[PDB]
Design a protein around this ligand. Structure first.
Ligand SMILES: C=C[C@@]1(C)CC(=O)[C@]2(O)[C@@]3(C)[C@@H](O)CCC(C)(C)[C@@H]3[C@H](O)[C@H](OC(=O)CCCCN3CCN(C)CC3)[C@@]2(C)O1
Ligand SMILES: Nc1nc2c(ncn2[C@@H]2O[C@H](COP(=O)(O)OP(=O)(O)OP(O)(O)=S)[C@@H](O)[C@H]2O)c(=O)[nH]1
Ligand SMILES: Nc1ncnc2c1ncn2[C@@H]1O[C@H](CO[P@@](=O)(S)OP(=O)(O)OP(=O)(O)O)[C@@H](O)[C@H]1O
Ligand SMILES: [Ca+2]
Ligand SMILES: [Cl-]
Ligand SMILES: [Mg+2]
Lengths: 328, 190, 188
């Protein structure tokens, strides 16, 4: 009746977020700490966007010469330890945030390292500053904090117990995955579908998907895990779709094969979903299917599910879609 | 069993761990031919191996001039601390014969902690019973941070003792790193 | 039990380990690590079976330090050469573990040769383990070596040099009982 269920993925794949929902969904209140945490993310984002406008090629000129002093303001605060968050900050954040040349630099975000609660929280500053404010669940799900360590969540669905194991999703953090490899029922590998134009932090060279592609491989072909079948969450489906539709940067450019690609017969396209979006979300699935397929020996199998983490409505659905397969 | 090799290890609790070393051993080492040395060593050690049984300690291993044993293995005991004590007790007594029987000033340096362990065997070939945990390292690091022909003991090993023993501050932190650095209160025995 | 002449002693430790040893509710009080030590130490003993190492004989593992010898089966010095090819082959074994443990482990070899004894100590558990100066040194070679290289003695170095091996002098090293003396690393 008990299911030691370990949770893997690259950096910022979306793990402690799925952890998040399982708690939202299946577990029984002074979030006042998590506010401070949100606040932090705001600084973090805006500093990071201004920062690289200069650092970029081409460089990126502020829409409004006025904002230049605000720029200056920001980086005069950038490394402060215990920050106090005075009201000017938000006036100046919003300002830069309003600046079109800033928002045009946002458009080149794939070209440097930036958290994906960016737009979302920047879009809602005024709400954040009110000292009576309490974060929506949406907001609370997006507060991003480095996972240094490993954390045991435990829950129950229809009196069936779960043991969620969260790991550090970065290079130096994977040395300690092993400790979860024995006495594991099955795996959740979480992947940031949308990060096909970006490189990872660890070196700032390796393409994030490509990284996670050949992390998958290293697990699906692992010595202590030829039994254990792996549930793949193709995470971040909203963002993905967005980029595809946005059409701005082409996929085949980042993964040259997409160009020879056509669209799968078992195609189960979301209702009203775009045929070109449908192409990529699956195509990406099939880059992982070329790994799961190419070995394992009908001795374990791959469960691919398109997912958005920050979507309890999609999450419950796919977790149901999952408690299911634990039976077998 | 089909993907990890089977693991011959069992967690154990409330066990006293001992380490002991030979002060100024290399003075003896330079003295005697590799042969007639081995003898005096294999001598004392089998005697140590013996008191062990008297004192209720499963011996672990010999690592050159280093000996170590434990109390609470294989099977639990309440007196567990007292045993590893009564062991050290007999060992400096024992080694004193070998001071007379040679003439060189070779002696001992005990160190004893009490905590959790692990125990069993590793790999496939040539098994030897063994123990592992910080608590263990700690005992070892107290063989390191001991003083000659005096028995060393921790915070914990006092607590499993019920002061039937007269003792005093060793303050081992001023001998060995790991002690100091981990806030360790050490004691000697009278 | 009895003495000997030309026994070659090797120690190989993995010093990256003493850190990696955690204890937590999550890692069952330090056992899940002991699990990986097992998966390695084993992977190493798997090498004894090898035909070309039929001559190699493991003695004991000390914490995560491996100990094994060529010679007790009796050009004439082939057995030292042998051993070194053993050491290297654990590194093959080890880079297999890293691969799958998402980790980085280097090996720390000390090696040597000369007068040893090879008997049984204490009646209570009678165990095969070798004494002698010769040995203590192969241990100094470990404890004072370098990750990912093999550090060997002045005597040893020559012999290995007499076998299509190349070497480099690390310099001078203290031994508590044997003063200061020249040591060497093999070149890959
Ligand atoms: C492997 C896990 C871990 C952390 C657990 C543990 O308790 C140890 O196995 C002890 C303490 C423990 O098993 C008791 C024996 C011994 C052999 C002392 C071990 C080693 O020191 C290990 O470290 C090593 O493998 C390298 C250090 C060896 C240093 N020793 C010091 C004592 N002299 C006599 C020999 C060399 C050890 C610390 O490693
Ligand atoms: N837009 C969008 N954002 C997501 C989605 N999933 C997660 N995020 C956001 O991106 C970040 C990634 O989630 P998080 O759990 O922190 O990554 P992670 O994989 O756990 O990071 P690590 O533990 O592997 S190092 C989070 O801050 C979360 O707000 C998604 O499906 N869509
Ligand atoms: N057969 C064996 N098995 C395991 N360890 C052994 C061994 N033979 C030697 N060693 C270890 O080899 C290491 C090096 O020994 P030093 O060169 S530091 O001599 P010292 O005796 O410590 O000198 P002191 O400080 O005056 O007592 C030691 O841990 C031995 O136990
Ligand atoms: Ca010693
Ligand atoms: Cl990813
Ligand atoms: Mg996380």
């Amino acid at each position: 009746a008990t299911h030691r269920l370990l949770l893997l993925g690259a950096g910022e794949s979306g793990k402690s977020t799925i952890v998040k929902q399982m708690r939202i969904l299946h577990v029984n209140g002074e979030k006042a700490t998590k506010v401070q945490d949100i606040k932090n993310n705001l600084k973090e984002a805006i500093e990071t966007i201004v920062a690289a406008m200069s650092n970029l090629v081409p460089p990126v000129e502020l829409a409004n010469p006025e904002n230049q002093f605000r720029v200056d303001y920001i980086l005069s605060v950038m490394n402060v330890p215990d920050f106090d968050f005075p009201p000017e900050f938000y006036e100046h954040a919003k300002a830069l945030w309003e600046d079109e040349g800033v928002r045009a630099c946002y458009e080149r975000s794939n070209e440097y390292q930036l958290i994906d609660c960016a737009q979302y929280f920047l879009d809602k500053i005024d709400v954040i500053k009110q000292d009576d404010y309490v974060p929506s669940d949406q907001d609370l799900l997006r507060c991003r904090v480095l996972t240094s360590g490993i954390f045991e969540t435990k829950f129950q669905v229809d009196k069936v117990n779960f043991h969620m194991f969260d790991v550090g999703g970065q290079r130096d953090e994977r040395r300690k995955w092993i400790q979860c490899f024995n006495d594991v029922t099955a795996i959740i590998f979480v992947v940031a579908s949308s990060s096909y134009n970006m490189v990872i932090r660890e070196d700032n060279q390796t393409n994030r998907l490509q990284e996670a592609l050949n992390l998958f491989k290293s697990i699906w072909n692992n010595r202590w895990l030829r039994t254990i079948s792996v549930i793949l969450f193709l995470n971040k489906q909203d963002l993905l779709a967005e980029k595809v539709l946005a059409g701005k940067s082409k996929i085949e450019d980042y993964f040259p094969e997409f160009a020879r690609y056509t669209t799968p017969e078992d195609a189960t396209p979301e209702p009203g979903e775009d045929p070109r979006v449908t192409r990529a979300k699956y195509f990406i699935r099939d880059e992982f299917l070329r790994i799961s397929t190419a070995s394992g020996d009908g001795r374990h199998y791959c469960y691919p599910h398109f997912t958005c983490a920050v979507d309890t409505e999609n999450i419950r659905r796919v977790f149901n879609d999952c408690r299911d397969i634990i039976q077998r | 069993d089909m993907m990890f090799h089977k693991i011959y290890i069992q967690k154990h609790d409330n066990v006293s761990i001992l380490f002991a070393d030979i002060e100024g051993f290399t003075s003896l080492a330079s003295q005697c031919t590799a042969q007639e040395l081995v003898m005096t060593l294999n001598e004392l050690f089998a005697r140590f191996d013996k008191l062990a049984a008297e004192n209720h300690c499963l011996r672990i291993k010999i690592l050159g001039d280093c000996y170590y044993c434990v109390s609470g293995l294989p099977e639990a005991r309440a007196d567990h601390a007292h045993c590893c004590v009564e062991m050290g007790m007999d060992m400096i007594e024992a080694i004193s014969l070998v001071r007379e029987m040679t003439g060189v000033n070779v002696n001992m340096r005990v160190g004893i902690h009490s905590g959790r362990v692990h125990c069993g065997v590793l790999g496939l070939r040539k098994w030897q019973f063994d123990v592992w945990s910080n608590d263990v390292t700690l005992a070892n690091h107290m063989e390191a941070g001991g003083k000659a022909g005096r028995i060393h003991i921790t915070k914990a090993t006092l607590s499993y003792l019920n002061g039937d023993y007269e003792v005093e501050p060793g303050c081992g932190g001023e001998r060995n790193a790991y002690l100091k650095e981990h806030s360790i209160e050490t004691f000697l025995i009278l | 039990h009895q003495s000997y002449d030309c026994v070659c002693v090797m120690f190989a430790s993995i010093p990256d380990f003493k850190e990696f040893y955690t204890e937590s509710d999550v890692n069952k009080e330090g056992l899940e690590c002991l699990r990986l030590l097992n998966e390695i130490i084993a992977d190493f003993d798997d090498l004894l079976s090898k035909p070309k190492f039929s001559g190699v004989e493991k003695i004991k593992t000390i914490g995560s330090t491996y100990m094994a010898a060529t010679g007790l089966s009796a050009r004439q010095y082939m057995h030292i050469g042998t051993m070194v090819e053993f050491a290297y082959a654990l590194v093959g074994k080890l880079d297999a573990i890293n691969k799958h443990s998402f980790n980085d482990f280097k090996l720390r070899v000390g090696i040597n040769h000369g007068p040893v004894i090879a008997g049984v100590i204490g009646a209570q558990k009678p165990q095969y383990d070798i004494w002698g100066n010769t040995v203590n040194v192969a241990s100094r070679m470990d404890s004072t070596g370098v990750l990912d290289k093999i550090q060997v003695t002045e005597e040893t170095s020559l012999i290995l040099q007499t076998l299509g091996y190349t070497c480099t002098c690390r310099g001078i090293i203290n031994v508590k009982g044997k003063g200061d003396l020249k040591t060497y690393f093999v070149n890959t």
